[PDB]
């Protein structure tokens, strides 16, 4: 049964609610982004209308084989009418195709559902600026002040400079980057660009990337691993055993691996600056954990909410424990009292 925080009151609508069978009363199912916890339940047999971005719709059709007649893509930043209700999709600054959804209820209430997002000041000048929001369904993944991490730009600068240094010292070093979902493509694209290489990957991953409308992509990626010195592998293979085995397959072309695991937050964030990060090393293999986040830090989240001034906040992440829920409610009250709404 569908939980309350996936239902939009006063509408026939649900958000990210595909694993509950036929939801009673639901006339349109929205999907914020193509990550498995959110799409769980969709397949070629789904026969209700699915509303989403163009990029999410490319992925539904090509990866999950959802039939085209049930996919309803909407343009961003554009007032659209769905089953008699005005909606807008806004960029969530998460993975490719990820959106926030603004719903203009028939009774005058305005609701923003952030999906998964990384808040940014740039959102304070979208169509959110123009009216009041009464209810906020909020991505609270890192809603505690211990969650700090650098900007995406600082992290990419670190990775570029690290990869370029190592491969200029040793032209026989291979760079490997871990992946398990869409998102974080800038990591491996920026490294391949500094090295003058395409990114090599499996057919399945190349297919996924060909759905994302990235400009000039045919210029940046390939399935020919032998032509490439930046390879992508499954995240589960980014360990000493998995990397040793990969280096064997490369046929004496390389004699060293430098590998990257983009994680979200890890507790080495509470002590160490990005400039100071060091790898784990065994023999000719080094592994860097880099804190490239596609979710809001605590400070970014706070700033967005204090700017928006919602009347009510409904968390959509960390909702399963009373200690989490109680923590989050305390922070929302602090924020409200400090800013005065
Ligand atoms: Ni996500």
What residue ranges define each of the domains in the chain, with the CATH number in brackets? 1-147+296-341 (3.60.15.10), 148-295 (3.40.50.12650)
Report the Cα–Cα distance between both ends of the chain, in Å, rounded: 35
- Residues 230, 238: Cα–Cα separation, whole Å: 14
Please state the separation of Cα 49 from the chain's center in Å: 24
Centre a 10 Å sphere on the Cβ of residue 187 and count the other Cβ atoms it contains.
25
Pairing assessment for the beta strands 221-222 and 135-138 based on DSSP bridges: unpaired
Q: 262 has which bridge partners?
A: 290
With beta carbons less than 8 A apart as the criterion, state whether 197 and 173 touch: no
Resolution (in Å) of the shown entry?
Answer: 1.5
Give the residues across from 81 on adjacent strands: 86
Report the distance separating Cα 225 and Cα 10, nearest Å: 52
Determine the distance separating the centroid of ligand 1 and the alpha carbon of 116, expressed in angstroms.
5
Beta bridge partners of 102: 88, 112
Q: Which contiguous run of DSSP H or E holds residue 161?
A: helix 152-169
Ligand 1 center to 250 CA (angstroms): 33
What are residue 176's phi and psi, to 5 degrees?
Answer: -125, 135
* Cα–ligand 1 centroid distance for 161 (angstroms): 28
Q: How far is the CA of 265 from the centre of ligand 1 (A)?
A: 14
> 324: which residues sit within 8 A by CB, 6+ positions away?
318
> How many angstroms separate the alpha carbon of residue 169 from the centre of ligand 1?
37
Question: 218: helix, coil or strand?
Answer: helix
Residue showing tokens 């967005």: 304
- What is the Å distance from ligand 1's center to 92 Cα? 10
Range 164-168 contact pairs with CB under 8 angstroms and sequence separation of 24 or more: 164/194, 164/195, 166/256, 166/258, 167/195, 167/229, 167/258
In terms of residues, how long is the chain? 341
Q: How far is the CA of 214 from the centre of ligand 1 (A)?
A: 19
For residue 181, what are its two tokens? 């979902």
Beta bridge partners of 269: none
Rounded distance between C-alpha atoms, residue 80 and residue 86, angstroms: 6
Phi, psi dihedral angles at 87 (to 5 degrees): -130, 155
**C-alpha angle with apex 225: 175 to 178, nearest 5 degrees?**
45
DSSP 64: S
| The token pair that represents 266 in the structure block | 């890890």
How far apart CA 89 and CA 76 sit, in angstroms, is: 5
Residues 6 or more apart whose Cβ sits within 8 Å of residue 88: 77, 78, 79, 80, 101, 102, 127
Residue 142 alpha carbon to ligand 1 centre in Å: 13
| SS3 state at 219 | helix
| Distance of CA 30 from the midpoint of ligand 1 (Å) | 15
Which residues, 6+ apart, have CB-to-CB distance to 272 below 8 Å?
none
Distance 189 CA to ligand 1 centre (A): 20
Q: How far apart are CA 269 and CA 48, in angstroms?
A: 43
The number of C-alpha atoms within 13 Å of 148 and in the hemisphere containing its C-beta is 9
SS3 158: helix
Distance CA 181, CA 179 (A): 6
Measure Cα distances from 97 to 29, 127, 184, 235 in Å: 16, 18, 13, 22
The neighbouring-strand residues paired with 282 are: 285
Alpha carbon distance 313, 42 (integer Å)? 28
How remote is the CA of residue 227 from the centroid of ligand 1, in Å? 32
Q: At what angle do helices 298-308 and 322-339 cross, to 10 degrees?
A: 50
CA distance 98 to 82: 19
State which residues have CB under 5 angstroms from ligand 1, the bound ion. Answer: 35, 116
E strand segments, the chain = 7-8, 13-15, 28-30, 50-53, 71-74, 80-82, 85-91, 99-104, 110-113, 135-138, 173-179, 199-200, 221-222, 230-234, 256-263, 280-282, 285-291, 312-315
Please state how this structure was obtained: X-ray
CA of 17 to the centre of ligand 1 (A): 14
Tell how far the Cα of 264 is from the centroid of ligand 1, in angstroms: 11
- Is the distance from CB of 286 to CB of 260 less than 8 angstroms? no
Q: How many CB atoms lie within 10 A of CB 313?
A: 18
Could you tell me the two tokens for 56?
């999410």
Q: Are 32 and 46 in contact (CB under 8 A)?
A: no
182 and 94 Cβ atoms separated by less than 8 Å: no
* 33 C-alpha to ligand 1 centroid (Å): 7
Rounded distance between C-alpha atoms, residue 159 and residue 326, angstroms: 38
């Amino acid at each position: 049964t569908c939980p309350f925080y996936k239902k939009i009151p006063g509408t026939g609508f649900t958000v990210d609610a595909f694993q509950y069978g036929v939801v009673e009363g639901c006339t349109a199912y929205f999907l914020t982004h193509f990550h498995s916890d959110h799409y769980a339940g969709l397949s070629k047999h789904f026969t209700f209308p699915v509303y989403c971005s163009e990029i999410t719709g490319n992925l539904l059709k090509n990866k999950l084989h959802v039939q085209e007649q049930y996919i309803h893509p909407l343009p961003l930043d554009t007032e659209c009418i769905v089953n008699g209700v005005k909606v807008v999709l806004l960029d969530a600054n998460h993975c490719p195709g990820a959106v926030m959804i603004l719903f203009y209820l028939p009774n005058g209430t305005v609701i923003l559902h952030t999906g998964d997002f990384r808040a940014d000041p740039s959102m304070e000048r979208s169509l959110l600026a123009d009216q009041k929001v009464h209810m906020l369904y909020l991505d609270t993944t890192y809603c505690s002040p211990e969650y700090t991490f650098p900007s995406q730009q600082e992290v990419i600068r670190f990775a570029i400079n690290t990869a370029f240094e190592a491969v200029t010292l040793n032209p026989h070093a291979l760079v490997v980057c871990g992946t398990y979902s869409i998102g974080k493509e800038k990591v491996f694209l920026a490294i391949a660009d500094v090295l003058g290489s395409k990114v090599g990957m499996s057919q399945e991953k190349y297919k996924t990337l060909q759905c994302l409308n990235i400009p000039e992509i045919n210029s940046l990626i390939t399935t020919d691993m032998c032509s490439s010195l930046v390879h992508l592998l499954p995240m589960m293979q980014i360990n000493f055993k998995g990397l040793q085995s990969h280096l064997k397959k490369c046929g004496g072309k390389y004699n060293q691996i430098l590998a990257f695991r983009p994680t979200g937050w890890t507790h080495s964030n509470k002590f160490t600056r990005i400039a100071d990060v060091i790898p784990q090393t065994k023999g000719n293999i080094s592994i860097y954990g880099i804190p490239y986040s596609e979710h809001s830090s605590y400070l970014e989240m706070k700033r967005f909410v204090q700017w928006l001034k919602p009347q009510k906040i409904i968390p959509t992440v960390n909702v399963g424990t009373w200690k989490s829920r109680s923590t989050m409610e305390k922070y929302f009250r602090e924020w409200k009292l400090e800013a005065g709404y």
